[PDB]
Design a protein around this ligand. Structure first.
Ligand SMILES: CCCCCCCCCCCCCCCCCC(=O)OC[C@H](COP(=O)(O)OCCN)OC(=O)CCCCCCCCCCCCCCCCC
Ligand SMILES: CCCCCCCCCCC1=C(C)C(=O)C(OC)=C(OC)C1=O
Ligand code: SF4
Ligand code: SF4
Ligand code: SF4
Ligand code: SF4
Ligand code: SF4
Ligand code: FES
Lengths: 589, 180, 226, 213
């Protein structure tokens, strides 16, 4: 039985536990290609089901994802409850190495759900985004305002009747009245967040740390309530990097959406391409050959080293030492020599395909990989000795913005922060994908405290492990096809397209109208550079995605920020922002 | 802090200063653009051109697959026909202020007419000049693919290639032929 | 009438054939020679489904769904392995002589043969021999003729002669050299000759007036009009 | 062959940019021209960019700052965090609709002289993001001096645009003092780079095949 086959996951013990606790008629199990039990529960039982899952013997501890879906245009809803809208809750049990997706059906007039923020505190921003983009109210939410769109925005853009393109609306006309209006709307109002202007003795300074700040990693504002230099409270203001990428997922064919997947986490590249192409290949019923798996793993590890190099050097720069960023970007140029040679592009290769990769490896790639693998380790040891073992850097980072396993789990923190808390959870080992089980590599874990310093050094060890994986990729590279033999491999091999008529027909229709994915739901979770990145794809049977939901880790980390930094100095927050490993394209999608 | 921590920190500061001062004796890593040209690998995705077949005619048959495959929608062209019946673009314009250099048009091209070439220097003063018409795209050679001729494979008859003259084609047999 | 398709019960008209009954239910069966306005003839052999007499029958037999009545109690499988392989083989047989013409063909993106090639999943060519070719005819100012693309589905002659009662279109020749067109060059004399461009599932008969300023179907802005 | 721009932030014009442009002739005598050339030389050889980034294009621009490219060689590495000390605004990234008043405010807080480089397809036109939350090009409200196509432009493309801006600065006419003289800004109407490079670009015949390294 192939891994992409539709399964209902009735043999999962959580289904039997829910059946024994709530009864057989309390929920409906949906057969998907997500690899996860999908359970439609009633809205009135959502909090009871969430509490029951939270207090299981091997419990579901992390709310991985929470978002909405507009089902009004979905023509293939067989076996599904009647829904105009729906809200899904992806929950992960780390100790079970399992996950479940709860789904709540909603009518058009009654678009309200009980809030999940009491069970999982990271549900706050997810519910704010679901309200922002779908107009679904969450009752009992402490502050249910817009988070992706400005406050003076009309409508909910992820609804099916909201137009996607900017050219549907009038072109952007910045006038004086409009500039004053949106600048008033952007102005922080401390009364709306429950903050005072000060105590009786002194006033609090409300400071904009961003969007244009050297330490904000993009279009990103934190509003700091400052007592001297102490942070009384902060409000991270996101949505300044909102690109409408999920809406664009409903707007591009399955093939023509791949470059958009590249720009979700723009230091990730092929790492961002991997979960999307794997989820589409689950929709298409494609099992890629071994050479495709090794090529994709090698490109993913090269871009992981690229991203980690930028992250480590920028952390060192934020701490104060500006020299290693020059050398680390030289190392990034060595990686880019290989990546440009293979894919033809530096930052956004757009090189993975449904069913494989765009081209075969060029002749002489192993020379460039060998050169980089000889170049890297002495440079990394030099960075470690010169900067990471400096005691001033240690005094800036050790013990700063620390949290444990409970705080990591309750905020959805994944990647180096979660493993710095000691929880050994990496997707490439727990749920292996793309042939990662054929490589030997270690997963570095922390001692129990997620420090700035611990997160950075864990990423250094991850860089060394990726160098080991790249050595194995260089030495044991399979001979074979770079594209699968499936009819839905998009596009087909180009030489056969150029001389064979049936291949030409397949290519013609795949690049123009698009490949037809039969109606299903698919999910792929990967270990991205900054944490766990996932694609949840709904096909309605067309050449376009009916719904493209991208879970990114930086959203969760930025929501975790005020809990972990409250009561610290501003310099601690600068170091914390440098050690999170986020970009705002990941946060806002 | 302890005395050992103070001495260790002094030593680490001295080590950092020493290693950067030794970097002062290292070979420079700078690639000196523009005096030394940027090396680009042969499949680097830069400026888009339209190419010609080995016979010298433009390869583009105005099939419009590149325009629909473009996720940006920054290609606009129109089919036209010569007297002998070959298809060619009457115009071909690319909005390079929009183009993301993803290469999906070249991948979708069934004639290898449109190609992304190793050239990145396309900065402009007015962005209306980033609209490249067919006169700014069509080059005088085959580009990256030296030999492929789509019309040598097509069944459609053009000048210099009658019915039955394409690759893997038999000569046409009239229905009035005496052979059974 | 109640039929069973792949283990699913359906209520259909017993006076209909199986192809039109299954297409009315939203099921996908590839077809060429059948048309709703022209009736069934069983020429192209593309619409094969496996038929079983009873529910407790596992052998089955491939039949033409267009030539089989949708009577009460029939069991059929569209997604049967032998049926899928045979439908793919029919597409492959049609592909052996088909010209490498899609970029310069006015039917591309609007072509039933392209759609059925993709629908059967046939994308790998293993035929290595020559493709037959044909000369074309001048059919007047409205219809352009390209007989290389013909799949010999007989739709044109059935429409033009049986339906529209035209006299100047016909089928000539024999086995794999069957030719569809006029007995000589000249304008198609039927007042309804233009429906051939939609009746023909390939790019043999195309709109010449559209071909002068051609664009693909996806690039078109449509509206319902009178 | 010059365009004269005069700004008027408090005039009877609400739509940004708050300026008027007119095609004029070169206003340029044996000493004023030489001293204007000296000022242009000093300004074009010392261009301090604003440390401002919106998206991935900023990563490529700061890559140009590092050792493997060393944009310091042109004298443009200083990278001010304050708009008052910056001469060049690089819109390096998408002009998000929420970020557009911020970009306008930061451009307003810069001081004379100021130049704008729109880096990347997003800043040029909206790029691939023809979407509800994205302004389709920063030149809808910011006057742009140099456009860089690319997604992202590579670091040497940013350097090439810096040299293009240097040639445009080296032949512009600006007020030598704010007390005496014409205060409008004269920018030369350069030949397009497309038309300049058309001769050598169309003459290309063969390129390397994409099969080797
Ligand atoms: C010129 C004179 C230089 C004298 C110091 C040489 C330091 C050499 C050096 O690089 O030491 C680095 C080392 C780092 O220690 P660590 O990271 O624990 O690694 C152990 C393995 N080397 O550091 C150490 O092991 C620390 C031992 C060196 C302590 C030097 C003390 C000098 C005298 C006191 C100065 C401090 C005054 C403070 C006010
Ligand atoms: C100045 C000498 C060369 C070093 C280049 C800067 C280091 C890399 C920039 C990191 C960065 C990123 C990615 C970034 O996205 C960002 O937001 C725009 C920043 O704040 C200004 C950053 O600092
Ligand atoms: S490279 Fe991509 S964005 Fe540019 S014209 Fe081709 S398909 Fe369009
Ligand atoms: S895909 Fe190729 S042949 Fe077709 S219109 Fe585009 S450039 Fe021309
Ligand atoms: S008739 Fe259809 S399959 Fe044949 S060349 Fe034309 S578009 Fe292609
Ligand atoms: S010309 Fe068209 S309608 Fe007639 S038999 Fe051939 S493919 Fe069928
Ligand atoms: S043009 Fe491309 S690389 Fe630059 S900001 Fe936009 S998506 Fe990122
Ligand atoms: S459609 Fe039934 S045989 Fe042709």
């Amino acid at each position: 039985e192939p891994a992409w086959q539709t399964r209902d996951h009735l043999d999962d013990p959580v289904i039997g536990e829910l059946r024994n606790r709530f009864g057989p008629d309390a929920f409906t199990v949906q057969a998907t290609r997500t690899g996860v039990p999908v359970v439609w529960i009633k809205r009135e039982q959502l909090l009871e089901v969430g509490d029951f899952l939270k207090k299981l013997p091997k419990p579901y501890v992390m709310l991985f994802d929470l978002h909405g879906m507009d089902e009004r245009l979905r023509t293939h809803r067989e076996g599904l409850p009647a829904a105009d809208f729906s809200v899904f809750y992806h929950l992960i049990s780390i100790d079970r190495n399992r996950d479940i997706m709860l789904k709540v059906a909603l009518a058009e007039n009654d678009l309200h759900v009980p809030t999940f923020t009491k069970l999982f505190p990271n549900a706050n921003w997810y519910e704010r985004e679901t309200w922002d983009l779908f107009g679904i109210t969450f009752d009992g939410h402490p502050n249910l305002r817009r988070i992706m769109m400005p406050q003076t925005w009309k409508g909910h853009p992820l609804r099916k009747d909201y137009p996607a393109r900017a050219t549907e609306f009038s072109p952007f006309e910045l006038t004086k009245a409009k500039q004053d209006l949106e600048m008033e709307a952007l102005t922080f109002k401390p009364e709306e967040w429950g903050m005072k202007r000060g105590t009786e003795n002194e006033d609090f300074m409300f400071l904009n740390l961003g969007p244009n700040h050297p330490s904000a990693h993009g279009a990103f504002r934190i509003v700091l309530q400052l007592d001297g230099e102490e942070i009384v409270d902060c409000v991270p203001d996101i949505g300044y990097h909102h690109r409408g990428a999920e809406k664009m997922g409903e707007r591009q064919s399955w093939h023509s959406y791949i470059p958009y997947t590249d720009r979700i986490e723009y230091l990730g590249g092929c790492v961002n391409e991997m979960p999307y192409v794997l989820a589409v290949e689950k929709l298409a019923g494609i099992t890629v050959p071994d050479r495709v798996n090794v090529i994709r793993v090698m490109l993913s590890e090269l871009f992981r080293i690229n991203s980690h190099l930028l992250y480590i050097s920028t952390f060192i720069q934020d701490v104060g030492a500006m020299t290693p960023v020059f050398f680390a970007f030289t190392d990034r140029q060595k990686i880019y020599d290989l990546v440009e040679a293979i894919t033809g592009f530096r930052m956004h290769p757009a090189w993975f395909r449904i069913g494989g990769v765009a081209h075969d490896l060029p002749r002489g790639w192993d020379r460039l990989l060998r050169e980089f693998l000889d170049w890297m380790p002495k440079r990394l040891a030099s960075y470690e000795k010169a900067a990471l073992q400096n005691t001033i850097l240690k005094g800036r980072s050790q013990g700063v913005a620390a949290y444990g396993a409970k705080e990591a789990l309750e905020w959805g923190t994944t990647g180096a922060g979660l493993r710095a808390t000691g929880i050994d959870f990496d997707v490439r080992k727990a749920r292996p994908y793309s042939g990662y089980e054929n490589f030997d590599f270690e997963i570095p874990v922390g001692g129990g405290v997620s420090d700035c310093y611990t997160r950075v050094m864990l990423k250094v060890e991850e860089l060394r492990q990726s160098l080991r994986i790249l050595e194995q990729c260089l030495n044991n590279m399979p001979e074979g096809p770079f594209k699968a033999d499936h009819p839905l491999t998009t596009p087909p091999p180009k030489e056969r397209t150029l001389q064979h008529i049936e291949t030409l027909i397949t290519h013609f229709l795949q690049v123009s109208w698009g490949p037809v994915m039969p109606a299903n739901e698919s999910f792929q979770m990967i270990e991205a550079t900054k944490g766990i990145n996932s694609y949840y794809l709904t096909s309605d049977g067309s050449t376009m995605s009916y719904r493209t939901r991208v879970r990114t880790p930086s959203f969760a980390h930025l929501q975790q920020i005020p809990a972990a930094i409250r009561g610290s100095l501003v310099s601690d927050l600068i170091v914390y922002l440098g050690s999170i490993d986020f970009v705002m394209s990941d946060v806002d999608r | 802090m302890t005395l050992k921590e103070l001495l260790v920190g002094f030593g680490t500061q001295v080590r950092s200063i020493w290693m950067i001062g030794l970097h002062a004796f290292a070979k420079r890593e700078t690639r000196m653009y523009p005096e030394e040209p940027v090396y680009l690998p042969p499949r680097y995705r830069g400026r888009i051109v339209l190419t010609r077949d080995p016979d010298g005619e433009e390869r583009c048959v105005a099939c419009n697959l590149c325009a629909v495959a473009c996720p940006v929608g920054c290609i606009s062209l129109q089919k036209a026909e010569t007297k002998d019946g070959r298809w060619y673009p009457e115009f071909f314009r690319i909005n390079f202020s929009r183009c993301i250099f993803c290469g999906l048009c070249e991948e979708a091209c069934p004639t290898t007419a449109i190609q992304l070439t190793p050239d990145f220097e396309m900065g402009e003063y007015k962005r209306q000049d980033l609209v490249y018409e067919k006169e700014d795209l069509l080059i005088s050679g085959p580009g990256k693919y030296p030999e492929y001729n789509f019309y040598r494979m097509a069944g459609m008859a053009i000048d210099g290639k009658d019915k039955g003259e394409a690759e893997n084609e038999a000569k046409p047999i009239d229905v009035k032929s005496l052979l059974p | 009438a109640t039929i069973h398709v792949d283990g699913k019960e359906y209520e259909v008209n017993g006076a209909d054939n199986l192809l039109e009954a299954c297409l009315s239910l939203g099921l996908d069966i590839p077809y060429f020679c059948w048309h709703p306005a022209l009736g069934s003839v069983g020429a192209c052999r593309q619409c094969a489904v496996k038929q079983y007499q009873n529910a407790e029958d596992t052998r089955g037999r491939l039949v033409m769904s267009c030539m089989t009545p949708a009577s009460d109690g029939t069991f059929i499988s569209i997604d049967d392995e032998e049926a899928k392989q045979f439908r793919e083989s029919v597409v492959e047989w049609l592909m052996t002589n088909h010209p490498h013409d899609c970029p310069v063909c006015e039917e591309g993106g609007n072509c039933h043969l392209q759609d059925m090639t993709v629908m059967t999943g046939h994308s790998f060519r293993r035929y290595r021999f020559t493709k037959r070719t044909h000369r074309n005819q001048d059919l007047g100012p409205f219809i352009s003729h390209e007989m290389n693309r013909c799949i010999a589905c007989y739709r044109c002659v059935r429409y033009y002669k049986d339906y529209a009662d035209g006299t100047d279109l016909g089928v000539y020749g024999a086995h794999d050299n069957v030719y569809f067109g006029r007995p000589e060059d000249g304008t198609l004399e039927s007042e309804f000759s233009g429906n051939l461009v939609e009746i023909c599932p390939t790019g043999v008969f195309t709109d010449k007036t559209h071909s002068e300023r051609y664009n693909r179907k996806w690039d078109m802005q449509f509206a319902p009009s009178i | 062959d010059y365009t004269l721009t005069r700004i008027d932030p408090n005039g009877e014009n609400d739509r940004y940019p708050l300026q008027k442009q007119e095609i004029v002739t070169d206003p340029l005598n044996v000493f004023m021209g030489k001293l204007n050339d000296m000022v242009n030389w000093g300004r074009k050889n010392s261009i301090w960019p604003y440390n401002f980034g919106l998206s991935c294009c900023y990563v490529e621009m700061v890559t140009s700052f590092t050792a493997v490219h060393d944009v310091a060689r042109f004298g443009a590495e200083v990278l001010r965090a304050s708009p008052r000390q910056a001469d060049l605004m690089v819109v390096a990234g998408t002009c998000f609709t929420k970020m557009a008043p911020v970009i306008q405010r930061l451009y307003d807080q810069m001081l004379e002289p100021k130049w704008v480089i729109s880096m990347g397809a997003c800043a040029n036109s909206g790029g691939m993001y023809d979407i509800y939350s994205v302004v389709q090009g920063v030149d809808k409200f910011i006057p742009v001096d140099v456009y860089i196509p690319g997604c992202p432009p590579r670091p040497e493309a940013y350097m090439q645009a810096l040299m293009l801006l240097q040639e445009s600065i080296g032949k512009e006419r600006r007020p030598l003092s704010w007390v005496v003289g014409d205060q409008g800004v004269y920018r030369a109407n350069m030949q397009s780079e497309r038309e300049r490079k058309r001769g050598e670009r169309i003459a290309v015949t063969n390129l390397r095949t994409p099969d080797e390294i």
